[PDB]
Each structure stands twice: as C-alpha cells, then as structure tokens.
C-alpha cells in the first residue's frame, strides 16, 4: 500500500488507475498527472467510487468523501467536501508533499506506446531511480506486447522434426527464429500437464528439439509470462576509488602467459568498477582466470546470459585452478551441469542472469551486459554487496533487440547505465587480448568503433574472401530466404576443398532450415553463439534493412575468425576501406 514517489520525495498510498505499472504519484503529483494528460481514475488503500448499490462513476474529479465512504455527482448526497480540490488529491501525506518541476516525465514517456526512441532518449536523460522506473517499464511493455500474439499447438502429430501446426484465432504471429521459446502446457480436461520446451522455425512443420518428445493430441506451446517485480537496489555503484590495497589477500607469483595482466591486476587493486568495450578476444577468455589465480580467496562472481557462454570460461575454470572453488546452479532449460550444482557455498560462483540467490560476495567480475535493460545490472548488484566490480561487456556485444523496432536505431553508447558513461569517462582497464581474433577483422572493426584499443596481433595469409555483389531479396511474414548470395556461397564453397568445415549462421533460422534440406549444414542462430567462436565461417544476411546493416549490431559476429573468414555483405556501407582479396564472380 504505502510505497514511494521520489521525484517529489513523497511517500504515497495513491496510484494512477489507468497506467503502465500502477505508478505511484503523490497528491499534487497525481494532480499534474491527471491534468497534463487524461488519467481520470486513481487507486488508494480503497478505490474511489460511489458506494451506493447500483451506482457507477469512474471519474474522481467529482466524487465526495461522505460518511466514512465516497459518493458522486450524478447520484449526489453532497454533504461533504470534494475529493479533488486545491491543487491536490485527498489522501495520506497530503501535507508532506513537494511536487514536480518537470511536469511531463510520465506525461511524455508513460503516455506513448513504449516503442519510440524518445522513451530511451529520456531514459538516458534521467536519474538513477527515474531510469530504474524506465527500465522496469520497458520490461513491462516487452511482456505486455508479447502477450498479444498466438499460441501454437499440435493437434494431430507426425514424425518428429516434421509435424503439422495450427495456431490461434485472428492474432498475428511474432518473428520466426528460436528467439521465442514455445514452452506451453498440455490440458487433459481442466488441468495443465507436462509438455517440455519447443521452438518453431521451419514449416509440414520442422521443429528443433531442445528435448526429445512424444507429442500427443492438442499439445499447446506458447510463452506464458509473469511480470518482473520492482527491484530494491541500484544498478550501478557510484565511482569511488580505493584509498589503498587494504583488505586484499595478495599473492607472490605474477602471471606471465598473459602479457597485459599485471597493470590491470593493480587496477583491480584500486578500481571499484570495471567495464571495457571489446569483441571476442578481449580478456573475457583468460583475464577472468588471471584474476582468479592472482587473488585466490576473493569472492569473485561470474555470469553470462546463457549457460553456454558461462561454459566458455567454466570449462577450464576448474582446470586452471582447483575444482573446489567454482559453481553455477542449473534450473529445470539449456544449462550445463559441469560445476558443483545445487551448491550455494563456493568461492568463484559462476551465474546466469536468469537465476541466482543472494548470500554474500566481495568482488564482481561479470561478463556481457548486453541483451537486457538495467534489470541485469541491478539484479547482480543486489545479488552481492561487493568491494570490487568488473563489468565485462560491450554496448555492441549482443545489443538487446528492441522488440518490434519502428523508428530507427539509437546510438550504441546509450545502453543501460554504464555504456554511455563508458566512453565519456574512459575505459576502466587497459586491456586488449587478440590471441584468437586476427588483424583482418581488427583493422575494420577498430577503425569503425573500437578505436586503438585492440591490437593487430596476428597476420593473414591472403585467404580472406571478397566478391562484389549487389543481390536480390525475398522476404516472408517473419523471416526471409536468400537466392543470390546463398547461391554465390554455394558455388564459392564448390571451389575450395577445405571450406566445408564452417558454420551457417542466419539472421533468422529459416536460412539454415531451408539449406538443411539439400545440403545439411548445422543450425546456427544470430541470437547468441554463446561462448562458441570458431575460425572458418559462412555468414549470411538475406534481408538487411534496419536490424543488420546499420551499426555494430553484429560487428562482433564479424569477429568470427582466427586465421580466415567469410562475411557476406550485400550493401555498400561497411566496405569503405576494407581490403579483402578482390576476385571475380564464377
């Protein structure tokens, strides 16, 4: 009941009747919320409505406070004083209220459909708590506009990986790839019954098996969502550098295999938070282990948004240093049970943004912070009250798709809370680790956005592929299948012997789904190639209008290779000075 309106710094019991999150607005604050826009309904400890039987008044501007109750205008016992009067709304804290100078914060960003770029613009032009309200409202609008599409179901079953699928009544269908997991429920007569986790991309309906299934009649698959609760801890911690190396457990040996570790070790010695801007091969592979060995007993927590990217470190986090000192817990969802699972007690707790309880910790070393709003930062800073932070990440690592984009692409810097801070105050560490990624990618990628931080560490043997091509497009309701650069990729792989050991990633899974029918290259998604980076690669774009060929949405997915790459680009923007070997079409 009693929450907090903070812009006016006013405890409140009121809330707007028709709004996004039942937001909390004080007396004068609810007033200029209900006169600057149209929100003529409020909720208190009890809702304001005439109490005579059969009466109906939604409005509050004409209700009266009667005999320990509320009465109204059309049906009027008016022995009272009006509820809305004298620049205020009747409630508790009617005296200890301040008001708002910026009248149109809610009136600007809580009044639109939460999809324009102006929402995020103002969210970055906010305070910590105001931008917390912003991030929670973005999660709320994500779920509330995801719960407006259909539910897939299999009513007569066919052979697995090739079924039939009817959907729903009149609703449209969302995008097509494995972004939306079709994990619904089955109904016997009134109850919900074990179903499993599914995903629909190819349709005759070809399914990808997150598990092996024996589908029965009627089985329904759809994401059923709850609402993210309000959070009680700030996302970012204010920048305060340490007086000394007091309270640390120093070691005697110094890392040697890593050539950019000692100065950054000292930095962690007197740095409180740490974020950098890097593609694969930026210390995310070895520097975490470097800190792990350089301070043994420090409570250091790691996390990636999916377990297959936590695995990229955890696979040898138990080999480089003893097993007894790491863990991450697996809920049951694709998660890897390598470590000591169902064990809160550990030292180097690996984690996933989706789930981890809170006991205690002291040092933060968290991986990518990309595909979520301030929820990711806040849940992990609430997870532990830490003395040191390392926010490994990038505003372009896996930039959060803004659901149904309608109005352009915003500046990459404007991420949750730290990426705009990031290159306005400078990178937190001196760190570049190009021991897998070669210089052929580094040249272009660092000349574009990551200036002078990553090194041209490894040379190339003039095998990088160029072929001038414009291309033609053909789109579907939720994806697109490519004629021309797909054919050119085919006839290119028919020229070189040792090129059929690559990946076939796709902007939407439809490309590899169609290709599996006649060649059969493995399925790959642009969603998250979690901790799985390989040298030889076949990249494809099909349709690239606003999600692909705009900014560094996947310029890290252009950092594919180690000694050789393929990166198909059907536009004429990201080639300005790229010098791939010029060879003619066959």
């Amino acid at each position: 009941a009693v929450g907090a309106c903070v812009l006016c710094n006013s405890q409140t019991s009121l809330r707007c009747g028709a709004c996004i999150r039942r937001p909390f607005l004080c007396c004068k604050c609810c007033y200029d919320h209900v006169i600057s826009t149209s929100h003529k309904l409020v909720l208190s400890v009890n809702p304001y409505v005439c109490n005579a039987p059969g009466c109906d008044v939604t409005d509050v501007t004409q209700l009266y406070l009667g005999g320990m109750s509320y009465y109204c205008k059309s049906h009027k016992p008016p022995i009272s004083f009006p509820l809305c009067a004298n620049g205020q709304v009747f409630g508790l804290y009617k005296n200890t209220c301040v008001g708002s100078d910026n009248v149109t914060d809610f009136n600007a960003i809580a009044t639109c459909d939460w999809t324009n770029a102006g929402d995020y613009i103002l969210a970055n032009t906010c305070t910590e708590r105001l931008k917390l309200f912003a991030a929670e409202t973005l999660k709320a609008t994500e779920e509330t506009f995801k719960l407006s599409y259909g539910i897939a179901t299999v009513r007569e079953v066919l052979s697995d990986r090739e079924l039939h699928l009817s959907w729903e009544v009149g609703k449209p269908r969302p995008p097509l790839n494995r972004n939306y997991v079709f994990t619904g429920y089955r109904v016997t007569k009134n109850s919900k019954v074990q179903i499993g986790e599914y995903t629909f991309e190819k349709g005759a309906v070809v399914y990808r098996g997150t598990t092996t299934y024996k589908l029965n009649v009627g089985d329904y698959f759809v994401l059923t969502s709850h609402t993210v609760m309000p959070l009680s801890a700030p996302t970012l911690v204010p920048q305060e550098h340490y007086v000394r190396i007091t309270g640390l457990y120093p070691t005697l040996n110094i890392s040697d295999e890593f050539s950019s570790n000692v100065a950054n070790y000292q930095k962690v010695g007197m740095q409180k938070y740490s974020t950098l801007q890097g593609p694969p091969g930026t210390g995310k592979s070895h520097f975490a282990i470097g800190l792990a060995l350089y301070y043994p007993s420090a409570r250091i927590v790691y996390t990636a948004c999916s377990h297959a990217a936590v695995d990229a470190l955890c696979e040898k986090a138990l080999k480089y240093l003893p097993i007894d000192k790491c863990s991450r817990i697996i809920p049951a969802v694709e998660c890897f049970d390598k470590f000591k699972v169902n064990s809160t007690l550990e030292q180097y707790v690996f984690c996933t943004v989706n789930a981890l309880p809170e006991t205690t910790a002291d040092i933060v070393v968290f991986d990518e912070i990309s595909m979520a709003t301030n929820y990711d930062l806040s849940v992990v800073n609430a997870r532990l009250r830490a003395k040191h932070y390392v926010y490994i990440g990038d505003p372009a690592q896996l930039p959060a798709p803004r659901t149904l984009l309608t109005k352009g692409t915003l500046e990459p810097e404007y991420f949750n809370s730290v990426c705009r801070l990031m290159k306005t105050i400078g990178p937190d560490m001196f760190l570049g680790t190009c021991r897998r990624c070669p210089a052929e990618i580094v040249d272009t990628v660092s000349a574009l956005v990551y200036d002078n931080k990553l090194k041209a560490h490894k040379d190339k043997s003039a095998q990088c592929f160029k072929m001038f091509y414009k291309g033609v497009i053909t789109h579907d309701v939720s994806s697109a299948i490519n004629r021309p650069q797909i054919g050119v990729v085919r006839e290119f792989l028919t020229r070189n012997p040792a090129w059929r050991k690559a990946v076939f990633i796709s902007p939407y899974n439809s490309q590899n789904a169609v290709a599996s029918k006649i060649l059969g290259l493995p399925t790959q998604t642009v969603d998250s190639s979690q901790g799985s980076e390989y040298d030889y690669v076949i990249f494809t774009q099909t349709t690239e209008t606003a999600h692909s060929c705009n900014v560094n949405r996947f310029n890290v997915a252009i950092t594919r290779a180690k000694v050789g790459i393929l990166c198909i680009m059907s536009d004429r923007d990201l080639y300005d000075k790229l010098q791939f070997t010029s060879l003619e079409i066959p």
Partner: protein
C-alpha cells in the same frame, strides 16, 4: 473562521453599525442597520459551524485510513516479527541449558530428535569439526544441555563405525567429519 467573504461583510457591517450607534442617532437608522446586519451575521454563523464539522470529519477519515493501512501492513510481517520476539524473550530468560544448546546450534552442533528427559532413551547429535568434539566430548562422557551423557556409538558420513581411540588432533583429518554421536542420559 476569518477567511471567508461572509466574515468580511459581517465585519464591515458590524463596524459601520457600531460607529453609527456610538455617534448617536435616530430609530430608523438603527432599524435599517440591524436589518442589513442580521442577514450577514446569519451568513457568517452558518459557515462558522459547517467548516468545523467538515474539518473534524476529514480528520476522522484520515485517521481511519491510516489505521486500515497500518493493520494491512502489520498482518504481512508476522513470521519475522514472531521470530525476533521469540529470540528476544529467549535472551531475557537467561537459562544455562537453553544458552548452552543455543550456542551449540549456533556453532554447528544441532540435535537430530527430541531431547529426552528420562534416565534412558537415545539422543543423536552432529559434530562437524574437531574443536566441537574437543569442547564437548572428553573421555567417554558427553556434556550437552547442562547434563551428562555416555557415548556408545560414532558414525561418519560414510556410515562406518569409528572407535573413540581413533579421534585425535592429527589423526582426525583423514575422516568424514559430520560424525553422529548416540548417547544415553547418565543418572
């Protein structure tokens, strides 16, 4: 109630009539002044009580809403409130047996069943480290809950019997430590 136009009109009429009467005058002027004064006086006097009733009623309504909100808040923290209260009273009791068992549970040595009161019946506890064994178990007797017990069995996490002579300072750290002592109440 001096913030209403009725008060202003009544005050001006009062002043005018009082000045005219104190100056001394005839009957018709007094009659006209009082006929123009009494209506304003009644106008003031009605609101003078209506405002008071409104103010007290508003105060009562705010009181009632505060009470409802506080009751709703209070009925949602009962588990934590009760646990804190119980441990406060347990502090205030100040008994040696209760203090002994509370400290033992706080360090890790908890029981496995209800503590018996008779001169018989079995009690099982868990001893997770050598220091607790050093403090409690010395010889073949057991001191727990301000009483005396006699050890008769020691079982490890692997459920193998360990003889009493085995446990020693350096001879212990090769064992499954969460031991389980089963004793009976000495007379």
């Amino acid at each position: 109630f001096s913030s209403l136009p009725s008060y202003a009109a009544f005050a001006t009429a009062q002043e005018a009539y009082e000045q005219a009467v104190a100056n001394g005058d005839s009957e018709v002027v007094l009659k006209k002044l009082k006929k123009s004064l009494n209506v304003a006086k009644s106008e003031f006097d009605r609101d003078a009580a209506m405002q008071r009733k409104l103010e007290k009623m508003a105060d009562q309504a705010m009181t009632q809403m505060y009470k409802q909100a506080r009751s709703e808040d209070k009925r949602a923290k009962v588990t934590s409130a009760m646990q804190t209260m119980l441990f406060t009273m347990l502090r205030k009791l100040d008994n040696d047996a209760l203090n002994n068992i509370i400290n033992n549970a706080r360090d890790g040595c908890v029981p496995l069943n209800i503590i018996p009161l008779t001169t018989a019946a079995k009690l099982m506890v868990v001893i997770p480290d050598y220091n607790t064994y050093k403090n409690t178990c010395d010889g073949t007797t057991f001191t727990y809950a301000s009483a005396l017990w006699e050890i008769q069995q020691v079982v490890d996490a692997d459920s193998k019997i360990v003889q009493l002579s085995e446990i020693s300072m350096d001879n212990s750290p090769n064992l499954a430590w969460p031991l389980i002592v089963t004793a009976l109440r000495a007379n």
